[PDB]
Design a protein around this ligand. Structure first.
Ligand SMILES: [Br-]
Ligand SMILES: [Br-]
Ligand SMILES: [Br-]
Ligand SMILES: [Br-]
Ligand SMILES: [Br-]
Ligand SMILES: [Br-]
Ligand SMILES: [Br-]
Ligand SMILES: [Zn+2]
Lengths: 242, 295, 213, 300, 267, 447
RNA sequence: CCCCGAGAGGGGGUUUUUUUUUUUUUUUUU
């Protein structure tokens, strides 16, 4: 029971967007040159994410070294000031966060060509400065951009998106208010394909609605890919022209 | 800005023969005759890009040159590195690549040289020659399967570094050349490693003889006991102008350095060269100088 | 609650109740478990302190190689008065800087000297208090190191005056550490003199303890 | 940690067998293992067996005080600590490993978060005293499918468990023993069942990313050998109400969306058979305990 | 320290810095700071925010959040939380800086806590969260500049209800849109390096490695204030220092701090 | 700032403070400014070209009639834009089938009504949703439209910004509907908007107050009785502020519950409190404080000396509370209290009949009369009317507006005429709606 | 396989958290 107009009869949402509109998507490449080999600053809505890619480089411990592939590590730092209400405890060892880090690794292990960087380590540090729904999808886009900036070989883009289901109405790119009022589905689409790297459903969804929700997400993720690709070629032209 | 220069900004996290640019996943060609090189991958006839960069065609070898990436050691490069660790009969030195380079005990010149008789105690006393933290000149002798470099210092030109200061620039700003050691006005000598690692020292007798009992002290941590302030203040100036060239994405050469060094003389205090507007103008003045001197 | 300790029932709530210049005692070498140990007890006005120091080293460090030794100092809360972990870490860092200027590290390659200071009994009888404990810590660590046989450039001692703590060596000619919380303004000269007096007294008693005992 | 060495021959054989519609145990690609459920003497004691996979769950509860934030809700926790008993591959107490945290999170999102257990009915006196239900899963023998086995073990246990009856006199809790009055069952809102899919790439990565026709192989409820050679995992949880409780494809081999939907529909047919199976074994267990109670009273 | 240097490099640097006309490796003067960039008010979710970038790539982000508390039970009205990337929360450097910073910004020491008071019973608790993305030296002064900038661009909710909970006892209610700017005087923390008999403001990475000692001196209301701490910038070359050096450092800060504040006070 | 996107879409920042349980949280949401907001008028020939389908692939219907109610110049044909206050006060008149046919409700208005009164907001939405050929209500999202969206000027109260926002919507609609010769009338009781339009500083906007607008309709005499509106020996005490009662409930000083008032005794009420075993009595007319039967009221315990036999600080009040619980167990003396706040009124559309005692047949102008509600547990209501002779012997529907601290009896207004008393039509209809029984035919959306 | 040496010698192929418009008779068909 929501007293707010999540989806008005006029087809308008609480923030003004319609059912199939992405939030403000602004990417940024090479933001921390003196701190990492690759870096990206993501702004997807009110979401603010710093992503740092450090590597490929020498492992700090020879015990943890693979002679056939690079070691891929991801650490997500959800800051205590990411939400409106400051969290008292840290999230560093939170099981929810360990799953997120693990999830991201399992995604890019099959995209990043780790086999061509044996005996090395790729460390991915992430700092979430502000959070407002669809943080998982934004995490995916931040890593993909930062990895490309580092000149690390990969097969294709991986675009992330979230889709809510308000009763029967699908809502592309959900914010915090919408996620609190409905079940959402997080997608990780590879390139322009229909293949999903990540399918994440944490709340109840009718089996009949799931296929349609996936269809909306994939279409939306393709637009995220285009925006990422667009901003990347723009930065490429501004650098290659000097 | 008498003491500190603080640039401020509000409401924002931050300030905000054609070369074909391609991104990962992008289709480059559909000609199966091509030999796919680095930066690419293929499936039957289709050849895709794995990195973001420019498509390169050399003969029948199609590859995509990345816009960014660490220094890639080629065989025969003149690099400057720091000893990261010492083990068994080799050192591992930090060059600035994906992996540490190796320096076998048999790839260096032991003190006393040709007259020295072989000793089995050398392998147990390697720390008396090169220990952790030491800087040195070295040549990329060979390459491993993955691409790692094997170094050697079997020359008087190569060896432990002293009598100066260290600084580094992106390796992209330093290219291969006939020679990377250069003599500059002010009695100082630069060592421009291809890996981006740069060593600025007081000009030694060897540096002079290059264009014109000591073998026991080739690994001494001791510096020249007599180094004038004029050389020290020259090193600082050469350091700042190199950082200035690097700040403007300007390729560092021996000519660009000396040109910047003399052009920077406009500014009385050397510390004035650390400010942004000074660095940008110095680099800009060099490009425009090459403009009207070239045409 | 905790699976490694017995902390009792969770619904339980702790019991809350309603409403010369210094006297010293020094002892060394009473802990057979380690290489060096010291007992420092001080009684003055409405505050007494009994702390124990223990030095473990030089022992093995299986990581890379170092030409000199590596010192670590850890302060532990005692039974009575507790302190913030941050505050104990801060004093530990302040103490590390001091003894890295005194301990002849060159004599202990690839070795570790781990110094523990137990704030066993700190009674507050007044019917940042950590500043008044600092000079006693330095005294305990100096005694313990000397008792352990660890080489020292000089007997490091200290003093406290109005929230200002300063440790001296070389007959008070030079300073190996300076600490200041609260206090007043332009009172540096007065604090230095008062602390040097405490430093001199502590150093005499320390030497007297290391010799006669 | 301790690794499981897999030869190239074994890797090539098991994968090639899949290319010929063969799996070593003789099952089908869409075939779920036969689930055997055994109840102990005490309520909440349940043993789940899937082929060689053996898991045991124990439900327990004790009087406790609810959190300040939730004065009307009781406490409920699920423990799934691994041990070297299931194999030397598992480190004792390793509760931060990738697979461990995933499994822990799948179960939590399937039972805890989903609200399978009526935590509101665990409250005795609001903001003062409540029941604290605990589900302890013990992994005895590992042959894959630990998630599916655990979800069944937890649910079968919760539905089999009975807590001591309680009469309330203000704040004075009168806990009736099983000797006085009979114990009271728990409140189950729905019955979540997990079905795990394993993905295999018969070709190379290039044909997975840019390949036209999809050829990735997906099998249901993989054994240990099949689990060690897969390229991607999918765990989907449903109930008889035809709703998805949770879906988790945490990375791995990129898979076609329509194929993932097919898996969800295939899993629904399995969870239906499993749910009905659990209910039947619970009825017979109740009939068995009542028949013995009649034979005990008659002989008394 | 952080940076790794050979014995030769350290000897050259030390002799150059210990010289009577002190020669800095970048040519700076013993009181000149390196150029920094500061961004503010970029976190709308927070009451205040700042981001400082050094010349060596050192980056720090500060966030300011508020919470209504009973000042009769909440002694500390300003809590500083430090998080250095790549370091454990219980690391020695982290906790030390955390403990230090909390003393620098105490309620009744270097901060006008009167501006945080709402009523006779309730006041605003200020959470200063520090995030050090990258740093190559002791980041204490870096963090200090960021906290300063953040606290000078912080906006708190405005009270509507009466301010006498003793009698009428009204529940604290605030306006729906208006926010009052937090007028406060944040202190600054300067760090100095001791090389021989010379004292350097804003020690670089290479400079700190060869330094004999260091000083951490706080600054508030146009004067030197506690906490004042001597600090070993490295651990291989730490030596005792003459008292006149300590008095020189305090004097050095006392004359160059207002210049820093002036360049920092620009809105 | 404001950012322009690729779709011609804009985005800004809506930031407000939410006070909850004595807490202060800064809430920030993003605010998108569109360019495809339909006027929803049949006359418009531009909007249907820029409109987009919703989630279910259905374009919104333009319902506002191309030939609305025509009024004497210079009004002519016209649409009506409502203010927040005129909605909250005369929602009954807004549901009257004989007036308000084409009405435009701004988004900012709809939002304010939702926050101030949810049940009225629901009734207003129902009017928009159940639009037919008789009544037509729409919701123009003015805050989302870049053309009409205004932002707070330096040193400007939120109430003045919102009034300026509504006025901007009227200005936009007026200019937008010029080619169709349809003017817009702003119905507002606020003196700020009327003055800003009277001065005619910027644009020409037809502003009329509620009563002033009604007097321009053909059936003014038939609907004037539906307009919401010394008469004492004593004066009721003022209600406590919301901030005070909220702190009172939290500090165990004040208590809320449902009050019962029997028809056998109107001078005594009793509230059911959770902390107390037996219901707390409320003796007196000042102590009841204009409360109705079934109302959720907030009460304050009276001193022990003021109790019935059949303090300064908060500490003493909690002690008084404990002494009250003890006294309830003893059954000798019973604690009394006084209502100081009305949480939720049980007010609704009541059925009653005019009392012949308060109506003068000789009077021709407007006069005050009393109406006897069919609920025997409820007081009588004052009514302003001119047709007092025509409503003399009939079952009428009235709705209570307010009950001022001065007035002895609550004030309300006339709504409908059910018919003559003791008739099958009037009595059955009164019978149903008194027991809350929806008898109206099923809406089009239902069928 | 790669590096090194006028003479098939040597060196390497990397290791738990945005969930709360409160009121007076059973049953069946209407
Ligand atoms: Br390399
Ligand atoms: Br215990
Ligand atoms: Br609850
Ligand atoms: Br098998
Ligand atoms: Br100043
Ligand atoms: Br509706
Ligand atoms: Br109550
Ligand atoms: Zn229009």
């Amino acid at each position: 029971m929501s007293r707010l107009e999540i989806y008005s009869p006029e087809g308008l949402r609480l923030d003004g967007r319609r059912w199939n509109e992405l939030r403000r998507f602004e990417s940024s490449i090479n933001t921390h040159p003196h701190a990492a080999d690759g870096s990206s600053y993501m702004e997807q809505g009110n979401n603010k994410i710093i992503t740092l890619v450090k590597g490929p480089k020498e492992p700090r411990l020879k015990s943890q070294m693979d002679t056939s592939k690079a070691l891929l590590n991801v650490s997500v730092n959800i800051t205590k000031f990411s939400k409106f209400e400051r969290s008292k405890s840290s999230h560093k060892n939170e099981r929810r966060v360990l799953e997120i880090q693990t999830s991201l690794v399992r995604m890019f292990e099959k995209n990043v060509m780790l086999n061509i960087y044996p005996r090395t380590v790729i460390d991915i540090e992430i700092h979430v400065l502000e959070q407002d729904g669809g943080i998982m999808g934004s995490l995916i886009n931040g890593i993909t951009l930062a990895l490309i900036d580092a000149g690390i070989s990969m097969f294709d883009y991986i675009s992330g998106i979230s889709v809510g289901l308000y009763d029967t109405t699908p809502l592309l790119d959900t914010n915090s208010l919408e996620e609190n009022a409905m079940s959402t589905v997080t997608l990780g689409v590879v390139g322009k394909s229909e293949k999903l790297s990540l399918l994440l459903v944490e709340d109840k969804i009718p089996l009949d609605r799931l296929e349609n929700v996936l269809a909306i997400g994939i279409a939306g993720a393709h637009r995220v890919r285009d925006l990422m690709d667009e901003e990347l070629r723009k930065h490429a032209q501004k650098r290659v022209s000097n | 800005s008498e003491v500190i220069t603080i640039t401020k900004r509000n409401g924002a996290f931050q300030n905000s023969s054609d070369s074909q640019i391609v991104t990962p996943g992008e289709l480059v060609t559909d000609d199966p005759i091509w030999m796919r090189g680095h930066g690419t991958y293929f499936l039957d006839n289709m050849t895709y890009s794995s990195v973001a960069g420019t498509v390169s065609r050399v003969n029948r070898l199609l590859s995509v040159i990345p816009l960014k990436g660490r220094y890639a050691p080629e065989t025969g490069d003149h690099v400057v590195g720091r000893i990261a660790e010492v083990g068994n009969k080799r050192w591992k030195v930090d060059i600035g690549g994906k992996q540490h380079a190796v320096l076998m005990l048999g790839s260096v010149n032991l003190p006393g040289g040709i007259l020295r008789r072989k000793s089995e105690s050398d392998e147990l006393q390697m720390r008396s020659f090169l220990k952790e933290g030491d800087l040195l000149n070295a040549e990329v002798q060979s390459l491993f399967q993955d691409g790692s470099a094997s170094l050697h210092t079997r020359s008087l030109k190569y060896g432990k570094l002293r009598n100066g200061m260290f600084c580094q620039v992106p390796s992209s700003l330093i290219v291969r050349a006939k020679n990377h050691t250069h003599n500059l006005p002010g009695n100082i000598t630069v060592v421009l490693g291809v890996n981006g690692y740069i060593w600025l020292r007081k000009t030694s007798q060897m540096d002079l003889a290059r264009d014109t009992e000591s073998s026991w002290q080739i690994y001494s941590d001791e510096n020249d006991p007599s180094i004038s302030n004029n050389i020290r203040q020259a090193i600082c100036r050469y350091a700042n102008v190199i950082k200035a060239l690097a700040f403007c994405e300007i390729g560092i050469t021996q000519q660009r350095i000396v040109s910047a060094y003399e052009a920077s003389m406009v500014y009385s205090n050397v510390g004035e060269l650390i400010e942004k507007n000074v660095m940008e103008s110095i680099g800009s003045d060099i490009l425009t100088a090459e403009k009207m001197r070239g045409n | 609650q905790d699976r490694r300790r017995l902390l009792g029932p969770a619904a339980a709530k702790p019991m809350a109740f309603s409403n010369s210049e210094q006297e010293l005692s020094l002892h060394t070498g009473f802990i057979e478990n380690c290489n060096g140990s010291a007992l420092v007890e001080a009684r003055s006005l409405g505050h007494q302190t009994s702390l124990i120091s223990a030095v473990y080293g030089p022992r093995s460090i299986r990581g890379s190689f170092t030409s000199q030794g590596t010192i670590s100092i850890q302060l532990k809360n005692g039974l009575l008065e507790k302190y913030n972990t941050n505050e104990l870490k801060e004093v530990s860092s302040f103490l590390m800087g001091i003894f890295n200027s005194v301990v002849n590290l060159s004599r202990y390659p690839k070795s570790g000297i781990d110094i523990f200071v137990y704030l066993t009994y700190d009674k507050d009888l007044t019917n940042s208090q950590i500043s008044s404990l600092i000079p006693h810590c330095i005294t305990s660590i100096t005694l313990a190191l000397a008792d352990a046989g660890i080489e020292l450039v000089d007997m490091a001692g200290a003093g406290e005056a109005n929230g200002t703590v300063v440790s001296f060596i070389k007959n008070g000619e030079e300073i190996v550490g300076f600490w200041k919380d609260d206090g007043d303004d332009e009172d540096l000269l007065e604090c230095l003199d008062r602390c040097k007096e405490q430093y001199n007294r502590y150093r005499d008693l320390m030497i007297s303890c290391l010799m006669n005992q | 940690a301790k690794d499981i060495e897999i030869s190239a021959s074994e890797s090539k054989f098991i994968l090639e067998a899949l290319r010929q519609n063969y799996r070593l145990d003789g099952r089908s690609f869409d075939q779920f293992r036969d689930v055997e459920i055994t109840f102990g003497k005490e309520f909440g004691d349940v043993s789940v067996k899937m082929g060689n996979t053996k898991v045991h769950c124990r439900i327990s509860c004790q009087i406790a005080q609810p959190y300040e934030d939730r004065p009307f809700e009781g406490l409920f926790v699920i423990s799934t600590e691994i041990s070297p008993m299931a194999g030397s591959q598992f480190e004792n107490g390793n509760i931060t490993g990738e697979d461990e945290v995933l499994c822990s999170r799948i179960i939590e999102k399937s039972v805890r978060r989903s609200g399978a257990l009526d935590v509101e009915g665990l409250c005795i006196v609001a903001g003062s005293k409540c029941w604290a239900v605990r589900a302890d899963v013990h992994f005895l023998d590992c042959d894959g499918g630990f998630i599916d086995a655990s979800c069944i073990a937890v649910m079968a246990g919760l539905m089999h468990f009975k807590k001591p009856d309680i009469t309330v006199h203000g704040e004075q809790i009168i806990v009736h023993p099983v000797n006085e009055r009979e114990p009271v069952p728990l409140g189950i809102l729905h019955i979540p069942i997990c079905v795990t899919f394993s993905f295999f790439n018969p070709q190379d990565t290039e044909e997975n990313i840019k390949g036209e026709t999809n050829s990735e192989i997906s099998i249901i409820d993989a054994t240990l050998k099949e689990e060690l050679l897969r390229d991607g995992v999918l765990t989907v949880t449903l109930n008889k109400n035809r709703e998805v409780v949770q879906v988790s494809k945490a990375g791995g081999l990129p898979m076609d969306a329509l194929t993932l939907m097919k898996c969800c529909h295939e899993a629904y047919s399995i969870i239906e058979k499993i749910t009905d199976q659990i209910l039947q074994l619970l009825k017979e267990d109740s009939e068995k305990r009542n028949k013995y109670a009649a034979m005990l009273t008659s002989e008394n | 320290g952080h940076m790794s240097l050979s014995v030769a490099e350290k000897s050259y640097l030390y002799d150059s810095l210990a010289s009577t006309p002190s020669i800095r490796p970048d040519g700076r003067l013993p009181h000149q700071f390196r150029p920094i960039e500061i961004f503010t008010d970029f976190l709308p979710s927070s009451n205040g925010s700042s981001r400082i970038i050094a010349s060596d790539g050192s980056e720090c982000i500060v966030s300011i959040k508020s919470k209504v508390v009973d000042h009769h039970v909440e002694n500390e009205l300003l809590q500083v939380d430090v998080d250095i990337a790549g370091q454990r929360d219980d690391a020695l450097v982290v906790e030390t800086i955390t403990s230090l910073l909390n003393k620098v910004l105490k309620s009744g020491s270097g901060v006008d806590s009167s501006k945080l008071q709402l009523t006779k019973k309730y006041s605003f608790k200020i959470f200063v969260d520090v995030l050090v993305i990258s740093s190559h030296s002791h980041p204490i002064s870096l963090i200090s500049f960021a906290i300063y900038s953040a606290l000078n661009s912080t906006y708190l909710p405005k009270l509507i209800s009466a301010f006498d909970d003793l009698e009428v006892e009204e529940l604290p209610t605030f306006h729906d849109y208006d926010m009052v700017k937090l007028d406060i005087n944040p202190p600054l923390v300067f760090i100095l390096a001791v090389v021989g008999n010379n004292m350097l403001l804003d020690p670089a990475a290479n400079e700190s490695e060869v330094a004999n000692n260091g000083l951490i001196i706080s600054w508030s209301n146009g004067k030197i204030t506690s906490p004042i701490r001597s600090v070993a910038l490295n651990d291989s070359n730490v030596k005792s220092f003459k008292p006149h050096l300590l008095k020189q450092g305090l004097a050095m800060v006392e004359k160059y701090a207002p210049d820093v504040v002036r360049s920092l006070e620009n809105l | 700032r404001r950012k322009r996107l690729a779709d011609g879409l804009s985005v800004t920042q809506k930031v407000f403070v939410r006070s909850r349980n004595g807490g202060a949280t800064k809430i920030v949401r993003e605010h998108y400014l569109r360019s495809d907001i339909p006027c929803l008028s049949r006359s418009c020939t531009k909007c249907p070209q820029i409109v987009v389908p919703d989630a279910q692939n259905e374009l919104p219907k333009f319902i506002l009639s191309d030939s609305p109610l025509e009024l004497s110049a210079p009004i002519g044909k016209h649409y009506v834009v409502l203010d927040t206050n005129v909605v909250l006060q005369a929602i009954d008149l807004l549901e009257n089938p004989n007036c308000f046919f084409d009405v435009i409700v701004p988004q900012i208005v709809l939002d304010e009504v939702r926050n101030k009164s949810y049940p009225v907001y629901t009734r207003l939405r129902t009017l928009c949703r159940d639009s037919d050929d008789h009544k037509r209500f729409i919701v123009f999202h003015n805050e989302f439209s870049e053309h009409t969206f205004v932002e707070r000027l330096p040193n400007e109260t939120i109430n003045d910004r919102n009034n300026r926002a509504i006025r901007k919507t009227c200005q936009w609609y007026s200019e937008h509907l010029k080619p169709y010769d349809i003017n817009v009338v702003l119905v507002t009781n606020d003196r700020l908007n009327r003055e800003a339009a009277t001065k005619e500083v910027e644009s020409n906007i037809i502003t009329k107050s509620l009563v002033q607008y009604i007097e321009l309709l053909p059936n003014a005499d038939d609907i004037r009785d539906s307009i919401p509106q010394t008469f004492s020996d004593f004066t009721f005490p003022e209600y406590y502020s919301t901030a005070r009662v909220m702190g009172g409930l939290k500090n165990g000083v004040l208590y809320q519950g449902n009050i019962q008032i029997s028809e056998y005794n109107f001078l005594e009420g009793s509230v059911s409190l959770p902390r107390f075993s037996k219901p707390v009595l409320i003796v007196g007319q000042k102590n009841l404080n204009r409360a109705f039967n079934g109302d959720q009221v907030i009460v304050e315990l009276l001193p022990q000396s003021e109790w019935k036999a059949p303090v300064i600080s908060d500490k003493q009040r909690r002690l008084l509370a404990k002494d009250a619980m003890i006294a309830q167990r003893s059954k000798k003396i019973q604690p009394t209290a006084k209502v100081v706040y009305i949480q939720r009124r049980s007010w609704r559309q009541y059925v009653g009949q005019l009392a012949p005692s308060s109506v003068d047949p000789q009077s021709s102008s407007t006069q005050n009369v009393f109406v006897i509600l069919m609920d025997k547990c409820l007081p009588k209501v004052r009514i302003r009317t001119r047709r007092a002779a025509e409503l003399l012997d009939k079952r009428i529907v009235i709705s209570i507006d307010s009950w001022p601290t001065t007035h002895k009896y609550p004030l309300g207004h006339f709504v409908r005429d059910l018919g003559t008393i003791e008739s099958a039509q009037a009595e059955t209809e009164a019978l149903l709606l008194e027991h809350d029984v929806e008898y109206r035919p099923f809406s089009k959306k239902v069928l």
